[PDB]
């Protein structure tokens, strides 16, 4: 049972830090989505202008 | 919060504080422990120990093992008489 207490963490190693950094750098990437909803939300509001 | 690692904190404890101390006592159980069933040292022979390691030993354990002790008192026990009655 302690070896199976040791089972588990076998093929956790692999990916532990990889799931550490997938989750962290891609999370890190919304800041071009923030800036672009910015510039979109510019587009909406003179597109409005216009429109009126 | 944000990312962090809540796998790798196996640093700060190990699994199975309970599960540690037994494996613990395993380990020095079954290392400290004879590879099959070494050191018996059985065979002794000195005056009184030629019956002791006969007699007293337990291949047999049956009522003769006791009986040898009634007859040499029997013996001694006769003379004792004859010197004495």
Same mark, same amino acid.
């Given at each position: 049972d302690r070896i199976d207490s040791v089972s588990q963490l076998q093929n956790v190693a692999e990916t532990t830090k990889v799931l550490f950094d997938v989750s962290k750098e891609t999370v890190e990437l919304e800041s071009e989505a923030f800036e672009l909803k910015q510039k979109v939300e510019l587009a909406h509001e003179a597109k409005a202008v216009l429109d009126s | 919060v944000s990312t962090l690692i809540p796998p790798k904190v196996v640093s700060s404890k190990n699994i199975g504080s309970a599960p540690n101390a037994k494996r613990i006592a395993n380990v020095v159980h079954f290392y400290k422990?004879?590879?099959?069933?070494?050191?018996?040292?059985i065979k002794a022979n000195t005056r009184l120990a030629r019956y002791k390691?006969?007699?007293? %030993?337990? %291949?047999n354990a049956s009522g003769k093992p006791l009986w040898h002790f009634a007859l040499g008192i029997i013996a001694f026990g006769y003379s004792m008489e004859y010197y004495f009655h």
């Open positions: - | 422990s004879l590879p099959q069933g070494p050191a018996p040292a390691a006969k007699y007293f %030993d337990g %291949d």
